Each structure stands twice: as structure tokens, then as C-alpha cells.
Design a protein around this motif. Sequence first.
Motif, PDB file in Angstrom:
ATOM      1  N   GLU A   1       3.615   0.895  10.001  1.00 23.45           N
ATOM      2  CA  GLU A   1       4.036   0.756   8.708  1.00 23.45           C
ATOM      3  C   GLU A   1       5.290   1.657   9.256  1.00 23.45           C
TER       4      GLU A   1
ATOM      5  N   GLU B   1       0.619  -1.275  -0.314  1.00 23.53           N
ATOM      6  CA  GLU B   1       0.551  -0.216  -0.178  1.00 23.53           C
ATOM      7  C   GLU B   1       1.018   1.432   0.184  1.00 23.53           C
ATOM      8  N   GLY B   2       2.326   1.278   0.979  1.00 22.21           N
ATOM      9  CA  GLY B   2       2.789   1.930   0.700  1.00 22.21           C
ATOM     10  C   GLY B   2       2.947   3.095   0.029  1.00 22.21           C
TER      11      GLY B   2
ATOM     12  N   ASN C   1       6.817  -2.029   6.694  1.00 21.83           N
ATOM     13  CA  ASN C   1       5.954  -3.156   7.817  1.00 21.83           C
ATOM     14  C   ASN C   1       6.452  -4.100   8.943  1.00 21.83           C
TER      15      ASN C   1
ATOM     16  N   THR D   1       6.304   1.325   3.017  1.00 24.35           N
ATOM     17  CA  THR D   1       6.594   1.294   3.961  1.00 24.35           C
ATOM     18  C   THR D   1       7.541   0.048   4.285  1.00 24.35           C
TER      19      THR D   1
HETATM   20 NA    NA Z   1       3.945  -1.533   3.287  1.00 27.94          NA
END
Ligand code: NA
Length: 136
Positions: free
Chosen positions: A107, A17-18, A45, A43
Motif C-alpha cells: 500500500e 481499508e486505507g 495498492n 492507499t
Molecule cells: Na487500499
Amino acid sequence: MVKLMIIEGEVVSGLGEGRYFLSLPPYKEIFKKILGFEPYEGTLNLKLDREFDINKFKYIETEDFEFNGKRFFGVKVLPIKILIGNKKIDGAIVVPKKTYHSSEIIEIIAPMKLREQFNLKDGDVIKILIKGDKDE
Ligand code: NA
Ligand SMILES: Nc1ccn([C@@H]2O[C@H](COP(=O)(O)OP(=O)(O)O)[C@@H](O)[C@H]2O)c(=O)n1
């Protein structure tokens, strides 16, 4: 009292996602402004042993942005030191409004891709350091 808190986190893999929203240039701008660096577009995690609530700390909420017609929610941000071996990297925890992960996953953002520059594999444990609290 200058209060610290050191937490351990197991490197884990997420939905990717990041990398996305960190690419968009008003985020780049706000993070550059807030944290004094431009984060690597991703990110890291980390799984923690217990629930993490960013509201227990003095966070920075970014504003919602409108980016060429589509809008985007802000995130709460909490600067931290990332302790990997002898080193102390500047980074931040970022908590977005909606998240598929549990509240034990956080994150982390940082100037560089931490996996690459520290040969991190899933399962590796690192530490993050949090200065002050909500009342400082
Ligand atoms: Na991530
Ligand atoms: N500061 C960072 C940010 C991301 N990464 C890694 O870079 C990849 C891209 O980030 P991501 O947002 O796609 O993270 P995941 O959701 O894939 O775990 C991920 O594998 C992260 O683990 C990193 O090593 N250091």
C-alpha cells in the motif's frame, strides 16, 4: 555505498481499508510529522513480482493509539519516491499489522489521489524508489 532500489508495481484494487484509518486524526498527525505531508485519505495498492518485507529496510513504526476509547495499531512506514512518467512524487509504503492482501501487495500513500492526478487505471505499472536500507 548510497544504495537505491527501483521496484515495479501493478496498480490493483483492494478492500478499501486505507481510506478509513488514514481519516483518523492521530494518523494524520503522525504522517504529517513523519513524512512532511498530509496524505490523501486512501492507499494505492500495487502488486509486485515478489514478496516485500518492510523489515529489510529502515522503517518507522508508529505507536499504537488510543482514540476516544477504541484503540488502533500502528503501522510501519517507509518513505519512497513514486516514479510516474517524468515525475517523482514523495510518498510512503505503509504496512499495517493485519492485512487481507498477499505479501506481494504493498500500500502506497501520497499527498494526492494518484489515480486521479495521473489517470491511473488498474493494470498500469508504476515504479517506486527506495533509498538506503536497514544498515544506513
Ligand atoms: Na487500499
Ligand atoms: N494516494 C492515493 C490513495 C488512494 N488512491 C485511490 O483512492 C481510493 C481510496 O483508497 P483505498 O484505501 O480505498 O484503496 P483500495 O483499497 O480501494 O484500493 C483507492 O481506489 C485508491 O486506489 C489513489 O489514487 N491515490
